[PDB]
Amino acid sequence: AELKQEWINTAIEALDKAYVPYSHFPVGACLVTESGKIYQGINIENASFGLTNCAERTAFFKAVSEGERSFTHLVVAGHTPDPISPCGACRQVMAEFCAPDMPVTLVGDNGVTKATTVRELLPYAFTEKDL
Amino acid sequence: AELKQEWINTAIEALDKAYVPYSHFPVGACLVTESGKIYQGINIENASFGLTNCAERTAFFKAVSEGERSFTHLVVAGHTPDPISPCGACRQVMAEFCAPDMPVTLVGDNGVTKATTVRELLPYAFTEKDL
Amino acid sequence: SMAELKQEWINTAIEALDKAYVPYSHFPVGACLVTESGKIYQGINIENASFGLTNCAERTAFFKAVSEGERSFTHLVVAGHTPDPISPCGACRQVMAEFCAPDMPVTLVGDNGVTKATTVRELLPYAFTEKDL
Amino acid sequence: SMAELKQEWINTAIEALDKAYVPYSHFPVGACLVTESGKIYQGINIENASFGLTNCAERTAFFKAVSEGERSFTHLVVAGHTPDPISPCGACRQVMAEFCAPDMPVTLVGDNGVTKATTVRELLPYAFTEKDL
Ligand SMILES: [Zn+2]
Ligand SMILES: [Zn+2]
Ligand SMILES: [Zn+2]
Ligand SMILES: [Zn+2]
């Protein structure tokens, strides 16, 4: 799968921009469209923890608000010894908007990475089929 | 894996008790503790859709509020032609409280079932390790 | 008396502080939701390693009650280890508006016996409802 | 004038109604969040097949703005296709309290030009804050 350095940079650079005054645990994201346009995400906490929003979802909400519907890659980065794991809530938003086989790159500290896909992160994904 | 009919019944019976005035899409859950005690869950919607709570999480919140910390099975049921899929948010709550290999049974209409586990529904799960 | 019952509901909400699952914030919140039939449901906040999946004590109480078929609520008590009475967050206030009458009383509790009397409508003015869906 | 700028923010929030991702409720909500520097951020509600993962228009606007480093907000407009001015839900009100001054004005819009003037404090009285964490 294609992986551009600007996408890695976008997700890592977001770590310094996250709004995490309660966890001090920043997460950054780079969501790529078919046209090559990049959307950066950060996690954004709330004094009521349950209203916290993840970096991956921030990037999707940005892109989707600008009318983007065709996504080709997602990079997620953390200050973690192994590649950062997206939480299950984010995996469900990725399934809403991405193809099962759309590539995902997970990044940690000191250059560690893990290559995966939407389907491998959320197998047997719930969809709108039966609503 | 052990599977008792009362657990299937508990999840299916919950379908008639769900609070789903907006989707009319009921989901039911049966969460089993080590002691054999059963906790039933229903999905519970809100006029602001984002405040909706899933049946699986309702069962965990019930059990955890009573001090339960040892879970041995989860059944989830829907009025669906294939076994109901837990959403990614629920999968993340299951990972908070359950062993990776704890069995999960998914049920649909006309007796269709799917046997899986917490780890298979949420691979490479995010944990508190690096907070 | 209504004041004596309210003291027992306050005690239930305060006991919930010891039951909370808050390994990340270490900030417990307790709730006591009271039904028309006299049954009480105790709530705790329940955190998740992914903070956004945390559930508040008030919502835990409502989800417990609603899962048992309760639809008629008469009082809600919320307690924290706070110098002033604890404030319910906006998300909880929206779940209260889903299930409770606007004039339902809510009692907020802090440390050393401090309390504040309010209602669902006072906590969430001009509340969003299902009317236009 | 402040009233003329507010009309343009209202227009931005109303245009967002056409941009919303609401394939389940078919109930669009639009937002226009205004910064101290004059920059605006448009929000839409964005639903999910699992309803609980839906994000409101107001929060979409805040998450867009905060991700670009914005921390100083001067106005928020929220619009719906509603006969009375649309009400922000409690969850959105709590995110507004995280980032906005209590006296920040909020303009609520409905169909046929109906508006309601309020503030963050009026929408979320006795707001929960970080003070005790
Ligand atoms: Zn996440
Ligand atoms: Zn779920
Ligand atoms: Zn709350
Ligand atoms: Zn909202």
Numbering used by the authors:
A (entry chain B), B (entry chain B): 2 to 132
C (entry chain A), D (entry chain A): 0 to 132
From the paper:
The former harbors two tandem CDA domains typically structured in a dimer assembly (homodimeric CDA or D-CDA), while the latter possesses a single catalytic domain arranged in a tetramer assembly (termed homotetrameric CDA or T-CDA). EfCDA showed the ability to convert gemcitabine to its metabolite 2′,2′-difluorodeoxyuridine.
The full-length EfCDA protein, encompassing a singular CDA catalytic domain consisting of 132 amino acids, was purified. The structural architecture of EfCDA is composed of a five-stranded β-sheet (β1-β5) encircled by three α-helices (α1-α3). A zinc-dependent characteristic is exhibited by EfCDA, wherein the crystal structure revealed that a zinc ion was coordinated by three cysteine amino acids (C55, C88, and C91) and a water molecule. By previously elucidated crystal structures of CDAs from bacteria and yeast, the crystal structure of EfCDA also manifested the formation of a tetrameric assembly. Molecules A and B were in one asymmetric unit with an r.m.s.d. of 0.125 Å, and the complete tetramer was obtained through a symmetry-related operation. The interface area observed between molecules A and B was 1224.8 Å2, while molecules A and D measured 943.2 Å2, indicating a stable tetramer. The tetrameric structure of EfCDA is assembled through intermolecular interactions among specific residues in disparate subunits, particularly the α2-α2 and α3-α3 regions of neighboring molecules. Consequently, the enzyme's active site is encircled by specific residues, including Y23 from loop 1 on molecule C, A48 and F50 from loop 2 of molecule C, and F127 and L132 from the C-terminal loop of molecule D, which may facilitate the regulation of substrate and product ingress and egress.
